Design a protein around this nucleic acid. Structure first.
Lengths: 258, 148, 125, 193
RNA sequence: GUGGCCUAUCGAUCCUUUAGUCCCUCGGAAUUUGAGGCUAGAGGUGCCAGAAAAGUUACCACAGGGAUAACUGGCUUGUGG
RNA sequence: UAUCUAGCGAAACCACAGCCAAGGGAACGGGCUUGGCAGAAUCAGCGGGGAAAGAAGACCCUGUUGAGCUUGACUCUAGUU
RNA sequence: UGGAGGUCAGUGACGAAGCCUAGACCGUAAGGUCGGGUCGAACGGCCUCUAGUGCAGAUCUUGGUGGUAGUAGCAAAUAUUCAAAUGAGAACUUUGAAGACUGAAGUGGGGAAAGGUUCCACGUCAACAGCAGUUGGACGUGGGUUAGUCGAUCCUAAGAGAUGGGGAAGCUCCGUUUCAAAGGCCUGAUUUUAUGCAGGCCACCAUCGAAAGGGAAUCCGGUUAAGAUUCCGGAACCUGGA
RNA sequence: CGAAUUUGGGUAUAGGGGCGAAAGACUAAUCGAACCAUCUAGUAGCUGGUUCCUGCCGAAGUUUCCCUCAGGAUAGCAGAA
RNA sequence: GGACCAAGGAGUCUAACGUCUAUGCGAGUGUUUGGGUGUAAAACCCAUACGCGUAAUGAAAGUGAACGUAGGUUGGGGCCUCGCAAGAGGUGCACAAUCGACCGAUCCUGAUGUCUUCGGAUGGAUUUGAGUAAGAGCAUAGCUGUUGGGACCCGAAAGAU
RNA sequence: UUGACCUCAAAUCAGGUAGGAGUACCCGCUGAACUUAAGCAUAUCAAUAAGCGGAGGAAAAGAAACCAACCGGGAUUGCCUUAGUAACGGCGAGUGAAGCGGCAAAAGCUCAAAUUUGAAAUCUGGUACCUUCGGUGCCCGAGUUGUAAUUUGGAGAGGGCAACUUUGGGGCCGUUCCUUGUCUAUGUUCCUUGGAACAGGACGUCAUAGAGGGUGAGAAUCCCGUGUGGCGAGGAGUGCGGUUCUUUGUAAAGUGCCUUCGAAGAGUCGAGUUGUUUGGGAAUGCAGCUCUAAGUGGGUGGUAAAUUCCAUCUAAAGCUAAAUAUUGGCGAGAGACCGAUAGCGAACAAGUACAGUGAUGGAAAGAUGAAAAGAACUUUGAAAAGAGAGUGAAAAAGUACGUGAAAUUGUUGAAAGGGAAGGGCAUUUGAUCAGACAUGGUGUUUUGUAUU
């Protein structure tokens, strides 16, 4: 707050053939007579100095947070969204990917990598490993020296060594079904994270989010309803119910007359 | 964010949207509510009539807890009954089995008669009631018992 | 990744600590790996390099050059090895400094303290 | 200064408000510190429940008259009825408040019952005993929750005689308003021979 | 017939002071004083939509103004010639 | 002294520049229009012009900008009674 | 344009960024892309986030550079000349000769304030001496200031200023003998115990304040590159002691 | 140009104060109120500046009130939704 | 104003808000004061309150929103019925005009009953309210606009300690 | 005359203690004006800056002379809220709390006023001894104008009836807190580029270690570390679970029932007035002066007064952790921050150089290379230096050193040049340059003898 203002500079006024900016008094220094106290001045204070009471954290409604988390969870089960998100799931038999609770019970990084190879997340692993590159700016000397992709997110129900086993393998994240961050479920606001569920995690999903037969276990919460019954508006349009009442169409490209 | 503001679009135009003739000066009409009786009197008398002067009598050390009295209307009276038993109470509309509603427990101080409770009798405990609400509840077949 | 709160992953702090390390800590910083034969014999991966240690260069333009340490220049963060020098235009031989990470130790100068250090690290002489 | 149709805003920022700005960046750090302090106190007093037993009292005013909450400490009358000295209760972990009285049989009875439940639920180690460790719980308030009284049953019978319950209120208000003038009138009629 | 034959002849907030209700409040309850509110007038702002207000500077200062005077120039030519 | 030579070597100032006549034009042009015209590179002088330079006119006016001084201005005050 | 989240498992020491290039292409444009040169370690496309985000001006700021311009100018204080030497080099240094000046309220010999090593010698000329320089108060390295008698030190002047005491919220103000119980100074006691005490006299107002005021006492000759009333030789004087 | 003389050193007076054989003179090139730091990034209806491109739309200098006349509010004119 | 060139250089952030818009939920809404938990300032979870909204009006004491299919009339998009194309009828949300009704305030009338001066039923009135009349709000974010702040940047003469 | 006592002195008497710094936060005193009010004086700024005095790791406040008006709460502090509200205000500009409610933290207390009166039972110091933050003797001293025990209003003190339930002080063992110390995996294998491999490719290994840094370029595996554990050293040890001398033997506290009592703070409450302050409004607090109390009295109950009652506490004496603050100090960890005209004034011998008599003012200034390998030697010059040579990946890195822009300049080359130059449209001339042609296709002359 005192940057640029630790001077006793005073304006010389008019009549001295110099601008009216405050100037440092004294002599024999090389700094005396120099401009001060201005954004345009070298060594002066910046325009509108940055304050710590700027708004840093921003509030979001709990329900909107849960809506985004549910959308990200649902996008994790869309095969095309995961590929578009770029997660090397071509070799995987089918997604969502569910693995037994023995994965929850795993202990070593070598066997965690072996499990990843067995289920097909290894390709995501090599993507993260070969994506390691230096940052492209002054973020290197701000403790952000390297960048790399995001690997699979292993979501469990109980921790019995899974977290530590997957801890060292690069790019793999591990999460509990209870938390299930949106920051991990849609990094960069891009839907379709590649998620490896455990069996217990997959079954706990229904209790933690609710269903049409069970309550959400989040009090006062229920999964959002859609504006539309289906996304196949093309199917609805080309259904007989609509086409029967629809009048015959033109040629889809009007012939140039005259 | 900063990139959506018109300051980003005024870059290159001399006056930054403030005019060449009348510039962006410091406080060219006063600071705050200055001149509200002299040169902002037109704005005052157009948009805030009643701004100047005092009317009522004072109240030194006024506590709002004295005047706490949230009002509950009759059309909203039946929402104070749990919805699990609300249907049963409405269908088994009889005396000697009337639901008891503690309006003070719900957090209201006065019952008002905005209209059309069903003909189900009900005992409603109220700190204060209005005349019309009392007649409506008596006609519906219940009673209002004053409480404190 | 690191876990404890007392270790700092700050590049600035790490570089400052390295470049202002006193000589006692520079001794550990200038540790060197033993050869395959020495590692098999002792059971030690790397040791702080000494003044009369025999080493071999395994990296740089002088790869595969053997020699006995002439000095351990901890201030310059290097070791000067006898028979690893440069001949100048005037014919004088100036020592060529190099980092102990780029040597392999082929024979240790053993003292009572060095032997005890080997036992501490878990060696068998 | 004053311009188009807008509310009159009273923003009190004419002093050096920028020197007195507290922005709570340490909210998370202070939460961690508070949890650490609670854990440290628990380990320091290990078997003890980290907080005293508070009484159930009534909220004072007419707005909050309905609620019943946790008080500072039990009345000397309450601790006597539970059957222990104020000093001993303070010793074995019961909050004792001297200045609070009880003009209320229900509140007195509820706090007596709270004291008896606490005495039944705690075990006090002897000064020179065998130290029977007892798997500490960390909250007397959680182990003895405040529960609101049941003022009435769900359903009853309608007892209607025809006071209208609003004429009653109007008459009570009128009686209170005109009491003093009525007393004065009676005084004059009695002092007039 | 709701003042002057018509078109002129007048005055906010705050404060005070009257008139009226015998009405509301003084917030732990009388009662009686006192005080504060409700509605309508009056005490005045003539700079008349309404600040409470003497000079001097030839010792002077600042922000400005060719929005504005003291030369020239320019239009006009009463007046002068 | 200026001047020429050897050495040494600044500054003011500078939108771009540097020939006029008339016109019109912010009513006194280096530029525009229409005419006169118009030949490298220069030296010493000179003081007509550059409305030359030097200073956000010190006169005048405006500002709800000051300050020094004065008084039966308004509002106070040390002292004194 | 700087930074941030994702992604291109993007470009790169087989050359990233940057810069230069009257070379090419694209866009109405802001601009983007590429050829060539230079360079040597990082950087970009896309989807989003973010802002200390775009300059021709502000007699803007800081730094740098011009024309003017090889120009104004380097003209007060009478004045220099000849020849040797040294030197790469001499109008300017050294020496010799001549001509002059200051002309004893000096351009001489010393000091006070101030400066601080400028003193002296040796070496040396990149910068500085508004020309030059071999010279210098410059640069480098060293040498040099010797007191009983000269000063300070002591005294008090105008004055400053503790104490006692009184103000003041207080930093501090007053006050300097004031409403103070304000000390040191002569001779015996004087080694059964000391410097005690029945020995005696008295009763100042702290202190600081002058390198020209007041004051104890040193002169001559010689001596150094540079100190001398200070060293040496000689010849004295004062103070305090026995 | 022998004195109301000139002058060294010491000492006293300090900023609404000093000092003045009096000029608002002098008080460190500063005086009709020194200098230093801070309040202070003091306020300015006043002057100056205000940084990329293209596309579409596109004015006002008028009404009323204002210690109002270099300024505001209001209505108008304009854009956008 | 600008001799020239490089770099720097001016509508920012915040508290409280207006309009509009997007989003979540919706007569409710807002987890983030705090607690729990954590791969630790993230993320995830959890209350009780409180804010705002769901009632207005009056200075206040206080009183407090259906004479009706939540009214009548006009106009209304859409829908329903109908003569093979014209053209009628029915129903008519939103919304806009108008006449009413209800709640508060003001001015009247004052009925049973009386603590005989309280009560205030009933009826009214060129009066009046930011009201009711099958709720819309609450949070978050964005541009623009407002005010306090150094407040787009630079600029006094001064004043105080 | 000899001894006290009281008050006042003196001592280089014995032992202590205060000052001064730093003051970010904290406790007070003093105290503006700029500013806003579009002027300005009340107001605002602001009970702020400057000035002065005083502490600590926090300070302060703190166990009601409280809030409240309720079915009452119950020391203090802080947060959310109350609330931009009640209220104040040229009722203008503006200002503006508190009760309740939810929470964090919670902790309580002690003197004065009492006769030990069958025993001043209290304490400092000197001198001894010892297990020395101290204990035990003895001895003068202090003190009866009152030092111990006993009681603090929640109470409690005596006097009677029963006759119950209850420990102390110090070493040792480990808790635990702190300062640390050491040990604890995995490639430098092969190939290309390069001065260097830390780059690319192949094959691997460890991973509870793929954070970060160094090393001749982007290094988990070369080094330090990192991760997970292990093993030590020293200080504090009465937050605490076990042994030790094991109990001063009438060595020590709480409870029920009846009686009599029940001391409770004075120039102080309070009142008036004056000044200041507050949202406090016929006066919120504070202070000056004047008056000046009482005993179920006294304070308060947010409108002045008289009379009538209710409610609530108990002032004029004192201590006390935690939640709270903290641009200073000392340790740490971090960032969508800045990147050498930026970020602190200061990345450097920076509060330095130097300016001012002084108070004070106050810069500029980072980068050879991986390694000086910092250029031997020859030659020309008086020398600086040049030309060669040499080192280096590079001298297009030579200390005036990374890159090396622009303004400005030299040379060379090309053009134009009759009192500016520059520009637009259009062509011309010179210079310079991009854009189909073997190519998916037509069918045969198969060249450098799946294909042309």
């Amino acid at each position: 707050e005192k940057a640029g203002h630790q001077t006793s500079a005073e304006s010389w006024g008019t009549g001295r053939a110099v601008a009216r900016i405050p100037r440092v008094g004294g002599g024999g220094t090389g700094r005396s007579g120099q401009g001060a106290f201005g954004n345009m001045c070298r060594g002066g204070r910046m325009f509108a100095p940055t304050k710590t009471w700027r708004k840093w954290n921003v509030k979001v409604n709990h329900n909107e947070k849960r809506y985004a988390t549910a959308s990200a969870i649902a996008a994790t089960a869309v095969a095309s969204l995961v590929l578009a998100r770029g997660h090397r799931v071509e070799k995987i038999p089918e997604i969502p990917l569910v693995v037994s609770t023995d994965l929850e019970s795993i202990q070593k990084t070598k066997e965690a990598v072996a499990a990843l190879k067995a289920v097909g997340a290894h390709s995501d692993l090599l993507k993260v490993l070969k994506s390691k590159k230096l940052r492209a700016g002054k973020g290197k000397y701000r403790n952000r020296r390297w960048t790399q992709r995001r690997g699979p997110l292993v979501v469990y129900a109980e921790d019995n060594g899974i977290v530590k086993a997957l801890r060292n393998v690069p790019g793999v994240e591990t999460a509990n079904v209870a938390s299930l961050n949106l920051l991990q479920l849609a990094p960069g606001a891009h839907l379709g994270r590649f998620v490896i569920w455990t069996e217990a995690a997959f079954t706990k999903l229904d209790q933690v989010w609710g269903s049409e037969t069970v309550a959400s276990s989040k009090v006062g919460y229920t999964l959002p309803s859609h504006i539309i019954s289906t996304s196949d508006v093309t199917r609805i349009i080309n259904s007989s119910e609509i086409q029967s009442a629809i009048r015959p169409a033109g040629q889809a490209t009007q012939k140039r007359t005259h | 964010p900063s990139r959506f503001t018109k300051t980003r679009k005024h870059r290159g135009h001399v006056s930054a949207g403030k005019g060449r003739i009348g510039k962006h000066r410091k406080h060219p009409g006063g600071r705050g509510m200055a001149g509200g009786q002299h040169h902002h009197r037109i704005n005052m008398d157009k948009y805030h009539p009643g701004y100047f002067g005092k009317v009522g009598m004072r109240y030194f050390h006024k506590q709002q807890a004295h005047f706490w009295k949230p009002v509950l209307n009759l059309d909203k009276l039946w929402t104070l009954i749990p919805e699990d038993k609300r249907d049963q109470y409405l269908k088994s509309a009889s005396k000697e089995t009337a639901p008891v509603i503690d309006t003070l427990a719900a957090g209201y101080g006065k019952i008002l008669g905005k209209g059309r409770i069903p003909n189900v009798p009900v005992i409603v405990k109220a700190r204060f009631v209005s005349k019309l609400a009392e007649e409506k509840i008596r006609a519906a077949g219940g009673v209002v018992e004053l409480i404190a | 990744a690191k876990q404890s709160l007392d270790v700092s992953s700050d590049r600035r702090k790490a570089r400052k600590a390295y470049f202002t390390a006193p000589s006692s800590q520079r001794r550990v910083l200038l540790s060197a790996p033993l050869s395959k034969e020495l590692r098999a014999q002792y059971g030690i991966k790397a040791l702080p390099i000494r003044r009369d240690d025999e080493v071999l260069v395994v990296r740089g333009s002088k790869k595969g050059q053997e020699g006995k340490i002439s000095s351990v220049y901890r201030l310059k963060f290097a070791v000067q090895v006898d028979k690893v020098t440069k001949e100048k235009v005037n014919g004088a031989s100036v020592p060529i400094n190099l980092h102990p990470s780029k040597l392999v130790i082929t024979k240790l100068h053993l003292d009572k303290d060095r032997k005890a250090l080997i036992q501490r690290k878990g060696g068998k002489l | 200064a004053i311009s188009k149709n807008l509310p009159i805003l009273k923003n009190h920022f004419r002093k050096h408000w920028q020197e007195r700005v507290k922005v709570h960046f340490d909210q998370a750090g202070k939460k961690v510190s508070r949890r650490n302090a609670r854990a440290t106190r628990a380990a320091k007093i290990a078997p003890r429940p980290l907080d005293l037993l508070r009484p159930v009292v009534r909220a004072p005013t007419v707005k909050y008259n309905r609620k019943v909450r946790a008080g500072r400490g039990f009345t000397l009358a309450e601790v006597k009825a539970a059957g222990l000295t104020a000093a001993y209760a303070r010793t074995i972990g019961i909050a004792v408040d001297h200045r609070r009285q009880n003009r209320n049989q229900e509140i007195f009875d509820a706090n007596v019952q709270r004291l008896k439940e606490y005495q039944s639920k705690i075990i006090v180690f002897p000064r020179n005993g065998k130290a029977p460790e007892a798997e500490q719980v960390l909250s007397a308030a959680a182990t003895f929750p405040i529960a609101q009284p049941a003022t009435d049953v769900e359903a009853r019978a309608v007892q209607d005689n025809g006071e209208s319950a609003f004429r009653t209120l109007r008459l009570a208000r009128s009686e209170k308003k005109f009491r003093g003038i009525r007393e004065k009138r009676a005084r004059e009629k009695a002092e007039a021979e």
